[model samples]
Target: GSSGSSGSRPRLSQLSVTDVTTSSLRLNWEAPPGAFDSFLLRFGVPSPSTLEPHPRPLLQRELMVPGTRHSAVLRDLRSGTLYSLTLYGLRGPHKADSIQGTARTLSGPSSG
Candidate 1:
């Protein structure tokens, strides 16, 4: 058997969600150049398909930037539903393992 050399690879950075509302969300990330080709975002209500099934995959928008910072705004999301989000860098036709995160849609104002 031959031993293989392994090292930690550069990863997508500063991934965050903000401006969450009934109908929209903002996703932001920073990437330092290494082997990344593009970014992929997947999101939907939490489910068995959280990783593979994106009821709403935001792939129509480009997630790649030559410099380190990138941002995207997702619109028309349903209100009061739980949602999960993930990000990945395309190294080729294949994608690197994703960095994962979760968020819930803004709930309606409470009666008080």
Candidate 2:
């Protein structure tokens, strides 16, 4: 299939942060359509820890995943920072359908 046939599958719903910490956050979401080679999560001025690694870019980070996965935790993240995040379905290094959302990591707790 040339170009892209995005309607073949379903997109994710209600991308949410189940838990949060100064350096990390737990990400949870529904399963993607019926078919997908891998799951890709990107974040930073644009990511997370799990079946994928943190995409450590100056403005963005992307995580490459395999198999069926619904959740993952992002680590080494900046606290109280607003990050631009994107989730995509990967078909062999190729990007398929994608969705965007913003995730803000919780700031450090008080010491005083």
Candidate 3:
């Protein structure tokens, strides 16, 4: 084996959703040990082809969290809809996955 060969592996830990509402949701996560340029959080509504399943897979929007921050809020989301959430730890040229999670926004008030 070689002596000084280092591989860049970007990662994030413990991604969770909180304070969910009909129009917004808050996401929090633990930063990786090494330095990262930023965190990329992608989310979207589930596709209709899946028979209205829970936590379907689809991406349509993205949010950039600063490296100094560990949490972010998503707004203007569909009420009572399952949204796909993917978090990526981004270095210069290295982007690694932490994990994928889903959070369904709270449903709105009663309708006629």
Candidate 4:
């Protein structure tokens, strides 16, 4: 494998929802192991489809996670809806099993 140049493998922790709002969520996670050159952050509204019940994501993204840093925040999400996210540990030529999590955004400011 070409995944070790002062590296080993990516380690992913159990991602958790740190905070939730009507249109956003703050996620918290950490990797205490080692390896991995970068990390990718993906989020979307997942659903069952005729294609395979659970299809691919509707959106995806990557996070800097520079220098032993972790955690990410997502915004502009749907209110009172469930969303899924995946965190990938990318390395020189290897990847981790990844940490996946799901959370529902809170309903709007509430009715008067």
On TM-score, the leading prediction is: 3
Residue-by-residue lDDT tens digits, candidate 1, 29-61: 777676577677776456574457656664334
Supply candidate 3's per-residue lDDT for 68.
76
The whole-model lDDT of each prediction reads: 0.66, 0.68, 0.77, 0.72
Candidate 2 lDDT, 43-84, residue by residue in tens? 756335435655654654677666377666778777788777
Of candidates 4 and 2, the better by TM-score:
4
Which predicted model would earn the best lDDT? 3
Candidate 2: segments with Cα more than 4 A from true spot: 1-8, 46-60, 109-112
Instruction: Kindly provide the TM-score of model 2 when superposed on the true structure, using C-alpha atoms.
Output: 0.67
What ranking of all candidate models by lDDT puts the best one first? 3, 4, 2, 1
lDDT (tens digit, per residue) of candidate 3 on 11-71: 6777789999887999988765555778888886656785767664544778887767878
Better of 1 and 2 by lDDT: 2
Flag regions of model 4 displaced more than 4 Å. 1-10, 50-62, 110-112
TM-score of every candidate relative to the true structure: 0.64, 0.67, 0.72, 0.70
For model 4, residues 1-46, the per-residue Cα lDDT tens digits are 5865675555677788967888888877777645566677788667
- The CA root-mean-square deviation of candidate 2, after full C-alpha superposition on the true structure, stands at 8.6
* Candidate 2 or 1, higher TM-score: 2
